[PDB]
Design a protein around this ligand. Structure first.
Ligand code: NA
Length: 200
């Protein structure tokens, strides 16, 4: 029905949790919310094919795994205990990848809002990619992304795909931006407070 509204509702709930006394983020709830974001990358077209493995598959890995994990803290603590944080396919490694996707969407939305009046998505898509993902991508991937930018949908077409007009889309995009920001900071802090780094 209204995919942007399902996204804003899910992330509002996560923001409430992270801002609540003694916050506990359930892995099932978190992974499900992240899955609502997955189809946005496909909407943007071939420039963002990388996100299929870099984000969507990683979300799906966490959803699958979530049946046996309670909270993000517990999940990460078990990886620290086993000393497998940076191992391929670890819950915590996949979490870091998912966090980056949420952040790219946050910047994408911020930039769409900031460029209101522009009919193109090229600058918002380019700026969000270059800030969030380019630093983690090899040159050949970066080149491929730049070539796919011509195939972005028009801004109007994206809103059509999301079943919203400009006014409503602005409201729900801004909502996602407001909710995701504290969540992303909460996630970064899980890593930084345990000296794990976030740039790997
Ligand atoms: Na669970």
């Amino acid at each position: 029905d209204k995919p942007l509204r399902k996204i804003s509702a899910a992330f509002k709930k996560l923001a409430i949790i992270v801002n609540s006394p003694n916050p506990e983020v359930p892995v099932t709830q978190f992974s499900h919310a992240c899955s609502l974001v997955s189809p946005l990358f496909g909407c943007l077209g071939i420039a963002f094919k990388f996100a299929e493995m870099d984000y969507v598959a990683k979300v799906d890995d966490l959803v699958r795994a979530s049946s046996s994990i309670s909270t993000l803290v517990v999940m990460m603590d078990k990886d620290i205990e086993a000393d497998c944080v940076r191992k391929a396919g670890s819950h915590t490694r996949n979490l870091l990848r998912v966090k980056r996707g949420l952040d790219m969407v946050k910047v994408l939305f911020e930039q769409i809002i900031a460029s209101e009046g522009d009919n193109s998505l090229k600058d918002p898509a380019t700026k969000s990619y270059a800030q969030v993902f380019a630093p983690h991508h090899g040159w050949a991937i970066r080149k491929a992304v730049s070539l796919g930018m011509y195939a972005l949908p028009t801004r109007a077409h994206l809103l059509n795909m999301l079943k919203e007009d400009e006014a409503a889309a602005k409201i729900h995009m801004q909502s996602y931006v407001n909710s995701s920001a504290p969540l992303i900071t909460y996630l970064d802090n899980l890593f930084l407070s345990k000296q794990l780094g976030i740039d790997w």
